[PDB]
PDB file of C-alpha atoms in Angstrom:
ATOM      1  CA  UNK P   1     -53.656 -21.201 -20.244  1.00  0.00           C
ATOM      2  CA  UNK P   2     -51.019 -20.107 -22.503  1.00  0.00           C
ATOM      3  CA  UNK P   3     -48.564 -20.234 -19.426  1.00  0.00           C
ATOM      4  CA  UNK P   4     -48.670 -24.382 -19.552  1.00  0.00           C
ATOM      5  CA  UNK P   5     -47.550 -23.555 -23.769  1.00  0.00           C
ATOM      6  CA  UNK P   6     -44.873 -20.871 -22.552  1.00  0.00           C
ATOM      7  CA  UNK P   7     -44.114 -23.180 -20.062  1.00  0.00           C
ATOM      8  CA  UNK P   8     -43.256 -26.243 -21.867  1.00  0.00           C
ATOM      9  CA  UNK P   9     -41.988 -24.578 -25.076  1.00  0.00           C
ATOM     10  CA  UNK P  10     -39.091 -23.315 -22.390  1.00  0.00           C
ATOM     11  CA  UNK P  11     -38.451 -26.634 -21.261  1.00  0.00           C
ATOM     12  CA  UNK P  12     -38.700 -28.053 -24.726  1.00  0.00           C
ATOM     13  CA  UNK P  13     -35.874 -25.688 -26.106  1.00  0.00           C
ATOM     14  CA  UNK P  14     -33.638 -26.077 -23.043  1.00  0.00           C
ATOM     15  CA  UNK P  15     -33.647 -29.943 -23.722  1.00  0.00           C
ATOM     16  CA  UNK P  16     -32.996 -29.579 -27.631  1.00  0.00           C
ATOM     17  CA  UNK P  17     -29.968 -27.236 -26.225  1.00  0.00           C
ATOM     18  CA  UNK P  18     -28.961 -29.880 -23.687  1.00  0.00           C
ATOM     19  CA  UNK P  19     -28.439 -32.420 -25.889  1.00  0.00           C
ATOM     20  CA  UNK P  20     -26.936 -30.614 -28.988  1.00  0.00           C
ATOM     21  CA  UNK P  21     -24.129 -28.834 -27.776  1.00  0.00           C
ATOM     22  CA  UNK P  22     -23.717 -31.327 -24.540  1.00  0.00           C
ATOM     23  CA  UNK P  23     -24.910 -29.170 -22.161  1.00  0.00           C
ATOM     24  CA  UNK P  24     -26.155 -29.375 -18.084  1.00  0.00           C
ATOM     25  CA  UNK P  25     -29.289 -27.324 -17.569  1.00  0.00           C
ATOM     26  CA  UNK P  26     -31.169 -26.544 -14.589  1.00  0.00           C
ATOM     27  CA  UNK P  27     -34.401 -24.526 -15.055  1.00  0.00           C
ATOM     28  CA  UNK P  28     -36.507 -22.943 -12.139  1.00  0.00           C
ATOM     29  CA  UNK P  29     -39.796 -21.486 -12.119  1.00  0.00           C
ATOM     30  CA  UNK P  30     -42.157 -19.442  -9.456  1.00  0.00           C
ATOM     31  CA  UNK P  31     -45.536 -18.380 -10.893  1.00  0.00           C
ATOM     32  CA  UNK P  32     -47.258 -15.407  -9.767  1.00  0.00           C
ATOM     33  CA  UNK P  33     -48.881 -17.372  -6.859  1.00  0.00           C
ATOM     34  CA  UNK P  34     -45.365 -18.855  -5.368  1.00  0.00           C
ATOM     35  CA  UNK P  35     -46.172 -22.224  -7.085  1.00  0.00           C
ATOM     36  CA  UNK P  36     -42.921 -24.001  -8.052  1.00  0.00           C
ATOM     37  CA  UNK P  37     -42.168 -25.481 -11.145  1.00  0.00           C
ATOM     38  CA  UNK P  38     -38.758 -27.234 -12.051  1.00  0.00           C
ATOM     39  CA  UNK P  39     -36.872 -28.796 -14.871  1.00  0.00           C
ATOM     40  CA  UNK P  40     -33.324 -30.557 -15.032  1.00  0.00           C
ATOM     41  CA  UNK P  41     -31.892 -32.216 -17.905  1.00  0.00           C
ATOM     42  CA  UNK P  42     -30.079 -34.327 -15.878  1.00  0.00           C
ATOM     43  CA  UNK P  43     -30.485 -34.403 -12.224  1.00  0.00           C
ATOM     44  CA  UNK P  44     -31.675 -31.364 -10.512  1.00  0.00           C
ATOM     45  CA  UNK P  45     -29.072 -31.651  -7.110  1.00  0.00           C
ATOM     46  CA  UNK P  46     -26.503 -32.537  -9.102  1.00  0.00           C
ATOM     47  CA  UNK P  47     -26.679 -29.897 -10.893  1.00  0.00           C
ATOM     48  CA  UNK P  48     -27.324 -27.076  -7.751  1.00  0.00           C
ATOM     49  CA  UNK P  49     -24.178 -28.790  -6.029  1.00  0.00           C
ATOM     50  CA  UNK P  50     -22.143 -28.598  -9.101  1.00  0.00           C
ATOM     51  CA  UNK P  51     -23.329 -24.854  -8.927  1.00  0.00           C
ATOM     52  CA  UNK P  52     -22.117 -23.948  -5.539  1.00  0.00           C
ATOM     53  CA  UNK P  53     -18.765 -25.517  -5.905  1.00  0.00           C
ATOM     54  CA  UNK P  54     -18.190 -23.157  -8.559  1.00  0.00           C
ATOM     55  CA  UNK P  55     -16.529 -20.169  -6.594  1.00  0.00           C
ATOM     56  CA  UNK P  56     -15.474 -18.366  -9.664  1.00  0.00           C
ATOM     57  CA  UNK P  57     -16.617 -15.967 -12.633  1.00  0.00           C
ATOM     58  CA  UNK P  58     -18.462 -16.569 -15.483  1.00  0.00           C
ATOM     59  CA  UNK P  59     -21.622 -14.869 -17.384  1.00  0.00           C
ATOM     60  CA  UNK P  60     -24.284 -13.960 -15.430  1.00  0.00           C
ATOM     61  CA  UNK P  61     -27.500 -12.367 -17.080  1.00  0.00           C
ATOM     62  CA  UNK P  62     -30.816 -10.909 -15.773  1.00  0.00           C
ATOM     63  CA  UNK P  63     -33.793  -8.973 -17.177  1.00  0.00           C
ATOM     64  CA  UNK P  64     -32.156  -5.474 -17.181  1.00  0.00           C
ATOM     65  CA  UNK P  65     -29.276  -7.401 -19.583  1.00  0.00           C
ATOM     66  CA  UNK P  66     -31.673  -8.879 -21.753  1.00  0.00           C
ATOM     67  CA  UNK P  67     -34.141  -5.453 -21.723  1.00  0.00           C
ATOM     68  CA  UNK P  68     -31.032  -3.381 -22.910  1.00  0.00           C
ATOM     69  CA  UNK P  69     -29.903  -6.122 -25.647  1.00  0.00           C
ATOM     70  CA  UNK P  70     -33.100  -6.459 -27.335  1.00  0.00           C
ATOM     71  CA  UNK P  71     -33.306  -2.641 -27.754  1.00  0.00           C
ATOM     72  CA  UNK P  72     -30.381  -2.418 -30.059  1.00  0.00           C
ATOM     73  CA  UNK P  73     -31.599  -4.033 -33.309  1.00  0.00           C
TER      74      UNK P  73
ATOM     75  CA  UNK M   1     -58.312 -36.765  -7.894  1.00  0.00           C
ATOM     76  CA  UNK M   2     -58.049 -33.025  -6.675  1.00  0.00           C
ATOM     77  CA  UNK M   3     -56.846 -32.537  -3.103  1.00  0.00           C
ATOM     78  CA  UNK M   4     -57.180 -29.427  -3.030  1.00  0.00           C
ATOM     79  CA  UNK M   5     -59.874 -29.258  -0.374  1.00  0.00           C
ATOM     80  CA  UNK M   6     -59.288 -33.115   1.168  1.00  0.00           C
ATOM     81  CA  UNK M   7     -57.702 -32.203   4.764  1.00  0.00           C
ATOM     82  CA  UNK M   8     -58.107 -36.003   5.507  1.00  0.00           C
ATOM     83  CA  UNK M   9     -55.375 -36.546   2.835  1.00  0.00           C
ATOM     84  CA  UNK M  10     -53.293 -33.490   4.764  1.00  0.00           C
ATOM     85  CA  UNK M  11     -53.303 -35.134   7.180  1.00  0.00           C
ATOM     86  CA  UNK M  12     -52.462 -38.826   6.398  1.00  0.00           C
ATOM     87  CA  UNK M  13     -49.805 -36.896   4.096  1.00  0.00           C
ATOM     88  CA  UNK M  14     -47.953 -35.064   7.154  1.00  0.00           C
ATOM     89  CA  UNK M  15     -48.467 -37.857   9.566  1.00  0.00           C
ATOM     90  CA  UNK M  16     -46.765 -40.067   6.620  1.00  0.00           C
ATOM     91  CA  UNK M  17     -44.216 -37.233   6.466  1.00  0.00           C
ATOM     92  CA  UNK M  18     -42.902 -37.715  10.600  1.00  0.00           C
ATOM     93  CA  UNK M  19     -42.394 -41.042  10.013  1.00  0.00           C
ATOM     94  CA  UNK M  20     -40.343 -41.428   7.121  1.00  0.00           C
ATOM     95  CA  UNK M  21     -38.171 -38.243   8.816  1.00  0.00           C
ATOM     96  CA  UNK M  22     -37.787 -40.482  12.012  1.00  0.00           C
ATOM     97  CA  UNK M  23     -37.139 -43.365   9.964  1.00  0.00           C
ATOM     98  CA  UNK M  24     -34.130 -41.124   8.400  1.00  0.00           C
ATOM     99  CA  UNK M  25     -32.546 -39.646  11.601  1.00  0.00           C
ATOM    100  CA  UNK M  26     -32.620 -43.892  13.008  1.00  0.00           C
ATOM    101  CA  UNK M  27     -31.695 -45.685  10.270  1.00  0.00           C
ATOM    102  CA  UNK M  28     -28.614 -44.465   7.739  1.00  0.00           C
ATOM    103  CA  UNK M  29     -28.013 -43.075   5.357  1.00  0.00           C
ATOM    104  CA  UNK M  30     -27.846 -44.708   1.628  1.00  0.00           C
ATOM    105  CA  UNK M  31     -24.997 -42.335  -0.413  1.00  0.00           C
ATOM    106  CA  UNK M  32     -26.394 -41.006  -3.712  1.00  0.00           C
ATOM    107  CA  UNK M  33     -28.816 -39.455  -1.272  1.00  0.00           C
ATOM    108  CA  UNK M  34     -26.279 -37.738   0.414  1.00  0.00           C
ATOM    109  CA  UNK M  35     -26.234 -35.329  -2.969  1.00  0.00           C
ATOM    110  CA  UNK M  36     -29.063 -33.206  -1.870  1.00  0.00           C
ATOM    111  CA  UNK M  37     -27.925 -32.620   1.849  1.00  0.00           C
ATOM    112  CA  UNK M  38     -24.243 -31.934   0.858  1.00  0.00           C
ATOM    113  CA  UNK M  39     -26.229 -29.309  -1.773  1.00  0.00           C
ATOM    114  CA  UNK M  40     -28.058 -27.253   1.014  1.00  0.00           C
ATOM    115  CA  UNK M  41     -24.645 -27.033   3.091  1.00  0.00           C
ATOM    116  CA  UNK M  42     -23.264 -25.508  -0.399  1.00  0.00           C
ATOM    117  CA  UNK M  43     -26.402 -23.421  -0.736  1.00  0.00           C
ATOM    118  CA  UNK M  44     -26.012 -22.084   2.687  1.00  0.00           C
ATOM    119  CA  UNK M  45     -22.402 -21.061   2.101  1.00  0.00           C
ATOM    120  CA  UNK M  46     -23.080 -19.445  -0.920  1.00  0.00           C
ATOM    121  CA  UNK M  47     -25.630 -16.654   0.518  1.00  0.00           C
ATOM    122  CA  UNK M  48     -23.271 -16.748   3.442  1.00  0.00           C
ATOM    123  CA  UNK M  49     -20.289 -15.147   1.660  1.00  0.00           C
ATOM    124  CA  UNK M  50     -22.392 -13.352  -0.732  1.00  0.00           C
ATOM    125  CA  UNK M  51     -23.103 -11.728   2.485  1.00  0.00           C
ATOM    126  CA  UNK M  52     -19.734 -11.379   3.783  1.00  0.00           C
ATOM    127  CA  UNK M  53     -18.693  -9.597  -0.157  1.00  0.00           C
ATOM    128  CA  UNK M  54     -20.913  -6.976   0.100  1.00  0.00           C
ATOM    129  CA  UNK M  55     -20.392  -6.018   4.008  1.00  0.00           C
ATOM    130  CA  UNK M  56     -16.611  -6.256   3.988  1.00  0.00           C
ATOM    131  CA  UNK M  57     -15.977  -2.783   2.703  1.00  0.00           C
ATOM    132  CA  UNK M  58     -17.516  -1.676   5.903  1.00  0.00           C
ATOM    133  CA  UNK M  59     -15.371  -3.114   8.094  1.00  0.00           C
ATOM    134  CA  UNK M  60     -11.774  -1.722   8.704  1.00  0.00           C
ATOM    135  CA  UNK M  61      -8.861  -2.155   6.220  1.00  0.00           C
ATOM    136  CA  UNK M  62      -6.961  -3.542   8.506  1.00  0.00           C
ATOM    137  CA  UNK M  63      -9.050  -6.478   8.909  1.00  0.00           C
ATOM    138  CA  UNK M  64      -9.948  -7.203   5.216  1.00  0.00           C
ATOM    139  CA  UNK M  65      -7.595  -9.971   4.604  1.00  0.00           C
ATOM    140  CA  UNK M  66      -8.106 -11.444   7.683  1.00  0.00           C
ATOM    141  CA  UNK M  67     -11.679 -12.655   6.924  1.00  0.00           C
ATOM    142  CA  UNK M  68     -10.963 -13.023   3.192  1.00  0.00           C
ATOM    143  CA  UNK M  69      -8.489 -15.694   4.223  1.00  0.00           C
ATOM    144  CA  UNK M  70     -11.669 -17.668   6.485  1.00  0.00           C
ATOM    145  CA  UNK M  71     -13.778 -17.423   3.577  1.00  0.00           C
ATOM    146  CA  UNK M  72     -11.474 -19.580   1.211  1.00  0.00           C
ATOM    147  CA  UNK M  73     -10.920 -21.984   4.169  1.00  0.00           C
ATOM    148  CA  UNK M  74     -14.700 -22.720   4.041  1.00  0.00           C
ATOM    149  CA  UNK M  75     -14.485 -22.848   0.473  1.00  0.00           C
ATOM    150  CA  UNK M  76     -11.821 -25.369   0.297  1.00  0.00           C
ATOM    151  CA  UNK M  77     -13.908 -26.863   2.910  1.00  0.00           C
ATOM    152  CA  UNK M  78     -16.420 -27.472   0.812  1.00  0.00           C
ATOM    153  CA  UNK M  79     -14.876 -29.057  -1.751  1.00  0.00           C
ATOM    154  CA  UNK M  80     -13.516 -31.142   0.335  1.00  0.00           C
ATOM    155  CA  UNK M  81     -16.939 -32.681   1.972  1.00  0.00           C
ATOM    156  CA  UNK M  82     -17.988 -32.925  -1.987  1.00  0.00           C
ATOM    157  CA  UNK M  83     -14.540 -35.267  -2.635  1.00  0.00           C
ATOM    158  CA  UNK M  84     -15.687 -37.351   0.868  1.00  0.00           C
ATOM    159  CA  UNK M  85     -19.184 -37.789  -0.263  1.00  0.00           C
ATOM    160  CA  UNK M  86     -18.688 -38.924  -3.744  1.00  0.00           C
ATOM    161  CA  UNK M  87     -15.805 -41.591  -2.250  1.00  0.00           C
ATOM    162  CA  UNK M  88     -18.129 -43.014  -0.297  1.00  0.00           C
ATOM    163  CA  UNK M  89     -21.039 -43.368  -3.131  1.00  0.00           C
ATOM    164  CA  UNK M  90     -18.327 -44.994  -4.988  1.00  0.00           C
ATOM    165  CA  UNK M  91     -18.169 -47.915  -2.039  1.00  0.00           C
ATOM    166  CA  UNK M  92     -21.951 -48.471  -1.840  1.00  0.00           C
ATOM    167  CA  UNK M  93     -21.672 -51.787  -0.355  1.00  0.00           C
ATOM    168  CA  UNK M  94     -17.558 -52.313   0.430  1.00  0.00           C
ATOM    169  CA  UNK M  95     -15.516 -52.787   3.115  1.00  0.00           C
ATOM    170  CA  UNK M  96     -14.401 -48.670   2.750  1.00  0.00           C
ATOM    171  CA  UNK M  97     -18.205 -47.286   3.099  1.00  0.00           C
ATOM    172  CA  UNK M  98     -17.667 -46.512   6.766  1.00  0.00           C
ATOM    173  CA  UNK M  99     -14.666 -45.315   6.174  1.00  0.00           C
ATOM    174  CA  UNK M 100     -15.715 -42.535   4.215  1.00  0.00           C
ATOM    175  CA  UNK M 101     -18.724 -41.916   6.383  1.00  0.00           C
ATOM    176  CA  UNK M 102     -16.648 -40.614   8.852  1.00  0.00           C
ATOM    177  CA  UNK M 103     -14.461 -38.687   6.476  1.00  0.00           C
ATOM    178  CA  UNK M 104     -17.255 -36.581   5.471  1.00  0.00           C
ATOM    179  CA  UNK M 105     -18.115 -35.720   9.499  1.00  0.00           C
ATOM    180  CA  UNK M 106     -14.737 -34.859   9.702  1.00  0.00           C
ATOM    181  CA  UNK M 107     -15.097 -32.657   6.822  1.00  0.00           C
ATOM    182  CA  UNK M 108     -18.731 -31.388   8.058  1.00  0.00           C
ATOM    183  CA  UNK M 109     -16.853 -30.807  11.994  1.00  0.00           C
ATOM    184  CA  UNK M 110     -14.528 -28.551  10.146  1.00  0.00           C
ATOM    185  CA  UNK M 111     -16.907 -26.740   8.283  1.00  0.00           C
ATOM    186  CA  UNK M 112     -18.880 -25.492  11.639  1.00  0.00           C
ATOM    187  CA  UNK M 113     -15.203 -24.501  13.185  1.00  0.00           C
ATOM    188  CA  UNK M 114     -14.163 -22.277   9.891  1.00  0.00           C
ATOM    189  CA  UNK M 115     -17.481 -20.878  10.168  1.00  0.00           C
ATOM    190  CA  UNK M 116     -17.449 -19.906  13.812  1.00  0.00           C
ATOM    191  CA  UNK M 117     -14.054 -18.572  13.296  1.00  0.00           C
ATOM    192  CA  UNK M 118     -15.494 -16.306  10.758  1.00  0.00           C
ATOM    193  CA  UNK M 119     -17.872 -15.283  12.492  1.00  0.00           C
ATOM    194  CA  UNK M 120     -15.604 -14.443  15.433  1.00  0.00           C
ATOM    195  CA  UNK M 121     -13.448 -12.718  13.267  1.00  0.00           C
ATOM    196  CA  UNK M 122     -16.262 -10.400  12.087  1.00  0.00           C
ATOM    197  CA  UNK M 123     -17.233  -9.788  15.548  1.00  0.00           C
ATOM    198  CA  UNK M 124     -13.311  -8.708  16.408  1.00  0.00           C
ATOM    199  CA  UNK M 125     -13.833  -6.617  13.118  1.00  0.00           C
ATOM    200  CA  UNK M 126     -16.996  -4.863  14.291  1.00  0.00           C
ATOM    201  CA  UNK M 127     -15.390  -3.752  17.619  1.00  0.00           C
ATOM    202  CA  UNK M 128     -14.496  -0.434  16.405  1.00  0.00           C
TER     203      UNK M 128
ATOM    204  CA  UNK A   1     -24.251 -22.641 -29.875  1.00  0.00           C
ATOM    205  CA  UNK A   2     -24.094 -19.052 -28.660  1.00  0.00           C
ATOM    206  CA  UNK A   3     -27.358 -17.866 -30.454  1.00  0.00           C
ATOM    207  CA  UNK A   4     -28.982 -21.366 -28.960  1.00  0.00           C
ATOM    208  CA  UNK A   5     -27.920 -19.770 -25.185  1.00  0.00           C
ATOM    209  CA  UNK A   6     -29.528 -16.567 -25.634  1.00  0.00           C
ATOM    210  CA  UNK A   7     -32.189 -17.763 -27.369  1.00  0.00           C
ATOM    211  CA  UNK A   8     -32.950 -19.269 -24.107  1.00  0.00           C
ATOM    212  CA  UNK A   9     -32.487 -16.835 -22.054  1.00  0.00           C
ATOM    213  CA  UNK A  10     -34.534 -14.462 -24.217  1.00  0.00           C
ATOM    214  CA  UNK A  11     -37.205 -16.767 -24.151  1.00  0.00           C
ATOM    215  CA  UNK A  12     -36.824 -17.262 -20.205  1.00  0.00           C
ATOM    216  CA  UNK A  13     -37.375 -13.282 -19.836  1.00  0.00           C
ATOM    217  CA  UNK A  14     -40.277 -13.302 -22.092  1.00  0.00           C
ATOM    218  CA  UNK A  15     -42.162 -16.116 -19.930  1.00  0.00           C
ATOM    219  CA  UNK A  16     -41.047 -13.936 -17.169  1.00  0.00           C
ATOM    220  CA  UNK A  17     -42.862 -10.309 -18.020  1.00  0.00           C
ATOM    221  CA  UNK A  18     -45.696 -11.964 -19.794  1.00  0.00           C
ATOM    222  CA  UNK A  19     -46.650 -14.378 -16.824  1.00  0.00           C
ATOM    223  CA  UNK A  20     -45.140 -12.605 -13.820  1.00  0.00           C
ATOM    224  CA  UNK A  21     -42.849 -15.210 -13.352  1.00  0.00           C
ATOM    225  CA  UNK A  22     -39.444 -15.541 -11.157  1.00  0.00           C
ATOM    226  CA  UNK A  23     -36.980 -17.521 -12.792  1.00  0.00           C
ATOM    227  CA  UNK A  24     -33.141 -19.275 -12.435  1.00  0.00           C
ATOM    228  CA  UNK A  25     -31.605 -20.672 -15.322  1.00  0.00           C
ATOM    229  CA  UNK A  26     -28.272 -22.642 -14.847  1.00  0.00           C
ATOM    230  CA  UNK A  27     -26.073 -23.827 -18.144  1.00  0.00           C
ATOM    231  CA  UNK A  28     -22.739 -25.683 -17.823  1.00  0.00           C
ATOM    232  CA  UNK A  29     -21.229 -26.073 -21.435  1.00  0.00           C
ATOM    233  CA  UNK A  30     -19.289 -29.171 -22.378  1.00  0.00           C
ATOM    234  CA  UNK A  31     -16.120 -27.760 -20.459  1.00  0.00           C
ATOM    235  CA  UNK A  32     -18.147 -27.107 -17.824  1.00  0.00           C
ATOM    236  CA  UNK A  33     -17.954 -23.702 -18.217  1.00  0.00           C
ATOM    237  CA  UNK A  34     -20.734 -21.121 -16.209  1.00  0.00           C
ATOM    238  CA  UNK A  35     -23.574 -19.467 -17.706  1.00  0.00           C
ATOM    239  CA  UNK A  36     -26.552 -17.905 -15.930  1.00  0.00           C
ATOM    240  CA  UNK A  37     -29.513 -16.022 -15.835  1.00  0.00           C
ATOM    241  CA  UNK A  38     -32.163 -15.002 -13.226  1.00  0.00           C
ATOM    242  CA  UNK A  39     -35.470 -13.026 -14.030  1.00  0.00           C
ATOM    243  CA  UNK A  40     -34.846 -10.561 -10.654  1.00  0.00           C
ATOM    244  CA  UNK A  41     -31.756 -11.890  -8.856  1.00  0.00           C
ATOM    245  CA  UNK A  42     -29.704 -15.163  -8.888  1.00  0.00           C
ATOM    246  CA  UNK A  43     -29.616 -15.070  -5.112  1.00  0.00           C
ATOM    247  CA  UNK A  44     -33.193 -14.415  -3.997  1.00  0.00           C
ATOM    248  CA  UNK A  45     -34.194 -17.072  -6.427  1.00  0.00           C
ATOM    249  CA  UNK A  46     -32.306 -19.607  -4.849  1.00  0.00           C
ATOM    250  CA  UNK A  47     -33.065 -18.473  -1.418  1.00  0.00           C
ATOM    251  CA  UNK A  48     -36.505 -19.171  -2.221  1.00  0.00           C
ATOM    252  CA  UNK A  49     -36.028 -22.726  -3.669  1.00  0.00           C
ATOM    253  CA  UNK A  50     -34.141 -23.409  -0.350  1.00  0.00           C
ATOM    254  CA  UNK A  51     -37.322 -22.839   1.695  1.00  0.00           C
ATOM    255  CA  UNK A  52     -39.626 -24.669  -0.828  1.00  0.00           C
ATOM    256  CA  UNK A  53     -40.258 -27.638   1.148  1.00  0.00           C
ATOM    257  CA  UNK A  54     -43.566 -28.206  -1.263  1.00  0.00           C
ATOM    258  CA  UNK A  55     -44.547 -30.612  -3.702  1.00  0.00           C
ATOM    259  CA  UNK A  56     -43.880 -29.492  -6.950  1.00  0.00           C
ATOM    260  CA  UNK A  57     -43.959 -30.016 -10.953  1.00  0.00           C
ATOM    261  CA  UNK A  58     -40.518 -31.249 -11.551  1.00  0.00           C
ATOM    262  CA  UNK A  59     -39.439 -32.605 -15.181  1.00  0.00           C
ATOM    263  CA  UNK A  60     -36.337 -34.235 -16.271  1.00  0.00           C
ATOM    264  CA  UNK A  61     -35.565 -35.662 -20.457  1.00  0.00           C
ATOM    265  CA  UNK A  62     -37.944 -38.403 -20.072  1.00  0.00           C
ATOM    266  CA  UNK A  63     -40.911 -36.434 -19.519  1.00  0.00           C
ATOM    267  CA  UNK A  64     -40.242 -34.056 -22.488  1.00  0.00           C
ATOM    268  CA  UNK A  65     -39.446 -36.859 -25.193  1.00  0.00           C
ATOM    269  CA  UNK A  66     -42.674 -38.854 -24.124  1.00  0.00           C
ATOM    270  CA  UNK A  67     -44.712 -35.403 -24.250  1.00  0.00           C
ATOM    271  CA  UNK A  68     -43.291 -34.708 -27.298  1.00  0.00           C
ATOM    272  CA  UNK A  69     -44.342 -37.784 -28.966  1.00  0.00           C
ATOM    273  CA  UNK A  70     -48.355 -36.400 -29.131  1.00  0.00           C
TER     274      UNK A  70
END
């Protein structure tokens, strides 16, 4: 419904951020009813093995991070 | 064509499905395919010392650096089956393909050993 | 390039809580430098693409430039 527009619009922005600032993006998606929906600007196990070799720091964010930002404006 | 509700096309789907995966385990084993198995094994390690991090502190002192030294071994053994594997997509079609087929199950061997010591040395940890 | 990263993430929550959605979201920058977000938890997430054995919408550039072109 307007999950397909959500949907898309996500995967829209995430390839306009890939290719402006040079960027490798993995996206992953479970819907309500365990349905799984993927996107990868370049290839998708590249990218998850290029995660796991990564034993090291870095950002990590979740909803409790981005709850807390947004209510400081 | 919805098929949602065609169990003829489950079917012809999962019989499809055995022979392709008998096809694999018989016939070998074009590299650039290799990318998604060698990602599971790094998948698997991943929740596997995300494990080990958060029991650790429940285990004696005197056995903390022990298993934190098994864990980097499997790390570095990772990396190492990820060097293998992209050395032998680079040789496609050479006279080194082989070669680095049986570099990476060397690497893969060594992986199961670091990870049965660590699990051995857990189990020497828990004996308390 | 920092306001283009959390708008993404900001808009990855908001598809989360307003369609009860679980999501990963992995960025390497240009140094290859780690970024990440997960709806719930990075680990869980991943755990549960691991057992996805399922067929699956799954979209790389191509499919967004020749969608966008409509």
């Amino acid at each position: 419904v307007t999950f397909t527009k959500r949907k898309f619009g996500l995967m829209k922005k995430a390839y306009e951020l890939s290719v402006l600032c040079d960027c490798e993006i993995a996206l992953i998606i479970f819907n309500s009813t365990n349905k799984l929906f993927q996107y990868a600007s370049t290839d998708m196990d590249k990218v998850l093995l290029k995660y796991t070799e990564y034993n090291e720091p870095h950002e990590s964010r979740t909803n409790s991070d981005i709850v807390e930002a947004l209510n400081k404006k | 064509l919805d098929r949602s509700n065609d169990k003829v096309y489950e079917n012809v789907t999962g019989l499809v499905k055995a022979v392709i995966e008998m096809s694999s385990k018989i016939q070998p084993a074009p590299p650039e395919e290799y990318v998604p198995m060698v990602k599971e094994v790094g998948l698997a390690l991943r929740t596997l010392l995300a494990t080990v991090d958060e029991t650790i502190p429940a285990l004696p002192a005197s056995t903390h650096r022990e298993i934190e030294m098994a864990q980097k071994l499997l790390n570095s053994d990772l990396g190492e089956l990820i060097s293998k594997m992209k050395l032998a997509q680079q040789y496609v079609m050479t006279s080194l393909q082989q070669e680095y087929k049986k570099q990476m199950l060397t690497a893969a061997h060594a992986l199961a050993v670091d990870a049965k010591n660590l699990l051995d040395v857990i189990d020497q940890a828990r004996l308390k």
